[PDB]
A paper describes a structure:
MRV is a prototypical member of the Reoviridae family of segmented double-stranded RNA (dsRNA) viruses, which is further divided into two subfamilies based on the presence or absence of turrets on the inner capsids: turreted (Spinareovirinae, including MRV) and nonturreted (Sedoreovirinae, including bluetongue virus (BTV) and the life-threatening rotavirus). MRV capsids are composed of two concentric protein layers, encapsulating 10 dsRNA segments. The outer layer of MRV consists of the protection protein σ3, membrane penetration protein μ1, and spike protein σ1. The inner layer consists of proteins λ1, σ2, and turret protein λ223.
Meanwhile, the outer shell particle, consisting of the outer layer proteins μ1, σ3, and λ2, appears to be a byproduct of MRV assembly. This notion is supported by our single-particle analyses of viral isolates (described below), which show a much higher percentage of outer shell particles in the late infection stage as compared to the early infection stage. Analysis of total particle abundance from the two-time points shows that the proportion of single-layered particles decreases between the 6 and 48 h post-infection points (4.1% vs 1.3%), while the proportion of outer shell particles increases dramatically during that time (0.5% vs 22.5%).
Author numbering:
A (entry chain F), B (entry chain B): 43 to 675
C (entry chain H): 43 to 72, 95 to 679
D (entry chain J): 377 to 430
E (entry chain A), F (entry chain D): 1 to 42
Write the structure that this text describes.
Amino acid sequence: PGGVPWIAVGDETSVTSPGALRRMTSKDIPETAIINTDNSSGAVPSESALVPYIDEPLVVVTEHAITNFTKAEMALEFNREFLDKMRVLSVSPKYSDLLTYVDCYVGVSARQALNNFQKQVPVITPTRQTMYVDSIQAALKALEKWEIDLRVAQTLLPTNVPIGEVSCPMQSVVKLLDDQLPDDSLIRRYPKEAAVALAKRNGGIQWMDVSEGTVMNEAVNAVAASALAPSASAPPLEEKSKLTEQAMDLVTAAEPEIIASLAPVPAPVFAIPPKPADYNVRTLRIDEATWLRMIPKSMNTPFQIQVTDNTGTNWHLNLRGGTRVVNLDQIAPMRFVLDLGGKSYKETSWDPNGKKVGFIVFQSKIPFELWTAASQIGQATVVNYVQLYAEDSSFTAQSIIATTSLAYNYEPEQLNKTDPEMNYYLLATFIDSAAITPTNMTQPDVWDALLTMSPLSAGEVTVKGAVVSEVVPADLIGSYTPESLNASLPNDAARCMIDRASKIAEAIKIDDDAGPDEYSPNSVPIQGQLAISQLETGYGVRIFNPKGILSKIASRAMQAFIGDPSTIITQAAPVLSDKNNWIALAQGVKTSLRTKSLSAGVKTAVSKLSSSESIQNWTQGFLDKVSAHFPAP
Amino acid sequence: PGGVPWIAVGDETSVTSPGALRRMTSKDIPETAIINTDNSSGAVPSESALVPYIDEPLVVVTEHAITNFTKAEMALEFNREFLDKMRVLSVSPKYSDLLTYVDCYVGVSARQALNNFQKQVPVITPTRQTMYVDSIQAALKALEKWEIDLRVAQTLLPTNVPIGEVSCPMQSVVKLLDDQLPDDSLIRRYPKEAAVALAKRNGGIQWMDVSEGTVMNEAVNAVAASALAPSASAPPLEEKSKLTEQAMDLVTAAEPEIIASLAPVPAPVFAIPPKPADYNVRTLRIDEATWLRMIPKSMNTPFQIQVTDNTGTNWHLNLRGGTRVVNLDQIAPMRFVLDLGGKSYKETSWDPNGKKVGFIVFQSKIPFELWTAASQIGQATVVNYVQLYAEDSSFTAQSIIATTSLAYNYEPEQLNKTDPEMNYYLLATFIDSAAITPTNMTQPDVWDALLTMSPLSAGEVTVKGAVVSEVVPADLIGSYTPESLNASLPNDAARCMIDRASKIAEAIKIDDDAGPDEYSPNSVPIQGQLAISQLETGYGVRIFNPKGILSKIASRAMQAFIGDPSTIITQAAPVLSDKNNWIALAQGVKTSLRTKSLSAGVKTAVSKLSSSESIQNWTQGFLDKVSAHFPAP
Amino acid sequence: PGGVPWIAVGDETSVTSPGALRRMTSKDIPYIDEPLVVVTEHAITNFTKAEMALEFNREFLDKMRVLSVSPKYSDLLTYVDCYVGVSARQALNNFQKQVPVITPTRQTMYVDSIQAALKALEKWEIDLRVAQTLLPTNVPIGEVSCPMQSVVKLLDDQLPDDSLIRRYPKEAAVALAKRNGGIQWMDVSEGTVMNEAVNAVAASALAPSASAPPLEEKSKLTEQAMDLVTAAEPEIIASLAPVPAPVFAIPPKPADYNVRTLRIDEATWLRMIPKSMNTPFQIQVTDNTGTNWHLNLRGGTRVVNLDQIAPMRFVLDLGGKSYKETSWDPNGKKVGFIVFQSKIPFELWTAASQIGQATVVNYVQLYAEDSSFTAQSIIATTSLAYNYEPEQLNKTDPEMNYYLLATFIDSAAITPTNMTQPDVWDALLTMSPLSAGEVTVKGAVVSEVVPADLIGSYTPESLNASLPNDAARCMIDRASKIAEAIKIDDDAGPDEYSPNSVPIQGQLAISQLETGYGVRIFNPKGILSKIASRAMQAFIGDPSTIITQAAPVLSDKNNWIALAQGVKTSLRTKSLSAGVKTAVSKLSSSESIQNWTQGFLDKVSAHFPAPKPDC
Amino acid sequence: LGMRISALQSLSDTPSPVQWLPQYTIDQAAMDEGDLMVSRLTQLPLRPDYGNIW
Amino acid sequence: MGNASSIVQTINVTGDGNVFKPSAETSSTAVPSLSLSPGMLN
Amino acid sequence: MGNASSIVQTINVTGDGNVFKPSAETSSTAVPSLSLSPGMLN
């Protein structure tokens, strides 16, 4: 049982009797006190002035703990000879010698204890537990160099074979080790003890008693090695079990109910840690990108405006037809980096050397396209800016801007969003300390560069460029085009769906080995859905297809999904644009992976056996080479 | 034992065939019925009209389930005080009072069960098990807000120190916790219950008793703490076990035997979920990319052709010298996306704005080089097309093309493939409803744009640009020059092998901590091979090196593998190109990992202890701050 | 117990005695003698479960005339009283009665028998899996129904032509009934039907309740989060004391640079001859095979410095560049790497006397093609490769200086007036580390690093010009795992306090109450809660914010240490629980999926109609 | 009872022993126990007829 | 452990005499996970 | 295996009659990891 032991205080007893129990303490049981333990290890002092007397609590050790700590003792008993040489822990610890057996009420709380009464419950005091674990840890600390050296000795030459059997004259092996052993190795200093430890760990190494002349297997771990070895016609049992476990854990990692729900799901429950994205504004279109604004090109009357920064130094700017801005509102907190490397921006009367390029933020009621006069800008601020520098380029008589990294952190909370009639705009442009003559500069902005966007809040989600409070995953299937996908924000719902489905793709891969156009346990649900759906009433010309053609179609569809997961969200995708097919696959994966019974494919079995034979042959050949040199006298 | 119980069919204790056994039910054991439940939880109705009376089966409960559900109930018992406060589940479920002990036959099938008679096995019905699970689950459901607030209280200030002990007056902690804890929290409403729960969870918190005076440790989880605690010379036990198990899982996932096979291995068993790749088709060199074709250069007779898509619309286009196409045979399914953003294609005699670019597919028995005068074109149709747009460019007096995502899916199954003579080609170029005069448009094609290919299958593997049915993993080592690696297809075998070996590299780095030029158990397998190989006789001058030089070279080899995992593929690699070294390392990793005995490295342990002591010092400083700014009375 | 059994050779025994113990063999039980091994309980239970995994398919195994008798592992174990242990000392200290023992031969035969049966059952197993998966047979929550005759009609309709169910339908029916308790077959002789499943405990573990998620999912998610955080190693990345480089480093990744476009002041691993020299000169260098190549140096030439760089591999690509001049043509030319080593610093070089010992390590031939622009030609893709391994050089003398240059080469002397381009560094370079145990800071190798001082020190440009083996990238890749674990373990929305964001709040409150230089300010608890929430959200959305300079809250050190400790102290104290919003969303989604399954079963019943009632 | 329903087909007795081709299942046993059972069931020693070798 | 004022209580949260001694050997733990795999439960 | 020294009183490392016969069934193992999860110990 688990929990602590309790003792009666009042005579009355019931499953809910008030105040009837009290914690049992070592004052009741003298055998638990540290003055009444057995110092077979030598931890408690023998001087009566060094052994304290303070009353101490009691806990209960569970059978799990007993088994695992005895396994911990076994972890030291392998290296007993070297511990003997170092004169450390002469008497091996025994855990059951620190447990006191008593019968009482056992439970975590008093109410649970009132209904529980066991006999031969084993209890310990915390200090005895700490002393035992400290002894084990000291023994482990003593054996670090020895363990590394023994692992080196085992790993120097092939000692294990995947299948079958090999053999070599042990004299040649010993000579090879003598020739390749490290100088500082404890294996040379203490040979016999290394030999005994190796005989314990492995069953191929065998030594004879020269007195009686007998040789036999002396490994102590036959039971586990039986499960590690591959029997005929089938891979090792533990490998199959572990691969199935890993696949099931991948499936559980991405919850299938969230990714195949037909009803709204909150944004935080759906979100995952995102990844950055890179864009170029000039190459982007206004129609596809829903977060861009442009002054209509028909203006042809640029105007110069002044704006102050946070410190109080004015700047000059020029706006004209075509000047592009990013519409900040309706987007989560975001991080922008502008990189102007590899660009010239060189004009007849404009030299990029020494010029300053910076971000500005405008806050105005008037929509951006209606902007003609200066006073319509409202409020503006130069958040950040950097000085430029040009170097000569590969092309003749050309120059390129060096590498720059300009940063901005859009945080809506630092702004006040109470007034709805308010527009927030972001610009990146040239700034000067004097007037910029419009005749001098003809570029609308500096937005023809690289722009890195990285999300700054993993709890909000956007669709097609606008924040949504809740998302319906089933309706995202088959509703995106590449033009609408590459121009999405970094925290889009499309990318979350792709990354949550990649785990399902890997899981399906692990347990399948089918080729092109072969039915599998995972490819049948789509076939069933197709077979049912083709018989349903619709509007077009109905088509009848047999069983084999449908099985081929389902196999191809599943393979296409595995190879490129994003196809489940692409418009006009062949089979994976029907949300019924996606839901069927997602639900059937769990059933397929739960009913496996320690099995593998036929192809995997045959390939594993063939490969094991090949490495067996290779190892035998290497040992023949080793025996040719370093010969046995 | 597990399964179901079985009883005789009434025979006089003479059961000599599996035909004389029938499965036990609740009529044969009346104590397992629904009406005999003790109903201490109040779940079963007391009205006699509502309790059903029907025959249910029986199943056997195993010790694993008993212990795990028994610990599940103690999970609830950690919060008995608040559960009392809400009058919920006043009596502990006590799983052991639901089972019934019967001497019967135990098994899954009658043939096995006949030869296995057991005494005192515990059985239960499905209904009572479901009721018990429901009771625990409801009790857990009623504690969500309370547990969250308790965790917030614990994590507001550090209550755990990595090593050693810290201290602070509790009055200061209570003042800080009153000042900072949220108003919504249930801690403010129910203080004493939270205090008792925290004293149970944490052994540090101790509450003095007003009536008596004794203050003592009262936590119920000391054994787990000692399993987590670090000794003053070694790290904790559990962390070492967890790290080694994770490394073993990575090695198991990497399939060390598949990537070391000396015999052919089928493509579906070797493959993994692939990744897309990007290219520039114009910039590739034809002798490196074996999957391109090009019409001979210096040809001085451009010709024009016409072609119609699946809607019958006619289109004009022209082929000239230098035009390139892509073989669409023997490359497996693949998806192409082409993007022209950032390129000009501007001449005085032709402007791209308003024009259309398309993918055109050709079928013909004549090689693409021997094409002219449109008589050799063969059957051909337009697949897809898109319209361009022009924007201002950074370079003065130039303009650039806006983004595109021209897509096409190639699925080899649909096309007939009837005549092996037949050849398939793909091309991207300008098309227009008016014939394009050769003088105006001189560009051979529009292949000067970014091209992304993504595989459409997971059981297809190519080499150097042609698909194969099987691969020999030991024959890919040291067989790729760097130029042949940037021109392979995304479904190449080299990428699969590199990704599989990356897991071995990660496992080795997780397990091993060695500095520059230091021997490790994971680097001697190369050393033994180097020694034996340098002894042998081949052709050329022999060089003999001692053990120190060989150890240094082996260590450098292992480091170069870990840092960059694609050196095994690379041709003319110094030491890792040889297949023997790769096979020996891959085989030795498993043996090196499997024979650790709860250990770590010296450097790791010492650095870890120093770090933990620094952490306790910082924690103590913070607690001094807290006790100094919140004075006790 | 475990290990092996032993027998006392003599009457005299004690806790620590010389001799006194020999190993038991097959002679000592009541010719070939084999050793004995003590069998634990874990093995017995797991092997029994493995046997019943075969026993699910007894009817098929009996139709095919295989496996007439079951394995029954508990026959092979022999019970005996003896000393037990791995070594003689442990055996001397122990003594147990009725321990089970077995010889290796019998264990191997047993496991081989199980494996043979599992090999013979494989196609049958795959066939039953196909039959179960073809139509929805499980639902997340609730209960759905469908007539059985329609289901069997659909199965007969769509099952493969070689499926083994079509040969053994009754055996397949019984097997499905054993696996799934939903599929029940009426007993004809008596007219009674009821559940005949043998798996009813795991079914309860995997089943949702009326209002709460399944227990198994909660336990699995918590274990996964703890495993991720444990792998992240919080103690190493929270250290305020130096930690060795091999411990801190984790496998690195390549990086892509442009050498010409970089600025000299940010990137300290570059050296450029001053532009005021104004005159060129030409030199002749001999490669490893004795070939002579002439190359020209001038002002503005840039070289990578190889002194304080870890073993690194450079691969260079020139694709897309023009390099076409009035009197030079890139087609047919050659470009290569040169490694200089000299005792004279680069900036002082004026004549061929200063070039030191030089060698053309690698070289390629340039091929040019027409480009998108009119009358413009660009170069094809190249992969120039070099492996800087320092230990192959003479690093014993300290005065030596090493440099790396990439430029045009030719067998004839290059006329200075034809080509005025300094080098070919205006091209895409990919650098990849070769040593996973050495780390650099800001462009110089460091013996040990302090994780508590890297945070809040890099400007964006400095982080750009970092080498692939920088300690900052190790810090980022070691904090990303903590970020992922927190995201798995949390569902807090905007401005919602969570047990994972409050340590920062406590640190902020304490720091606010302290006295320091500046204009003192005060805040309530609500403002601090919001500030902590924004800081944690920004961390999760961008793990690279701890190292970025002038960060809002995460540039500080105390906040980072507090968060790193809070992750562990919060994950360790859960009780099989889940968030409120997560629970309600799971319930609603499961009910929707149940409705969709029921609708599909209605469609299945509409087609493949069942026989009408007889009377 | 699990049995097919069918009546026996009568046959007359063969006056000499008949050939028998055995077929092996996947069951296995140790060689020593096989030799032991062969020793138990055997009818040796005996004196047979020799016949002619040429 | 938040503030609460009362006349007489069995344990006083804001009183003097308590102990706040966080240690590595005591630590804090609950029941976060259990072994409930389908194969092992049976 | 031990090297550069021979001792024959009990086990001669360099003597005759020793067996080196690696096999798949015998394999080689130690105690790599255990079950020390906090929820299972208690």
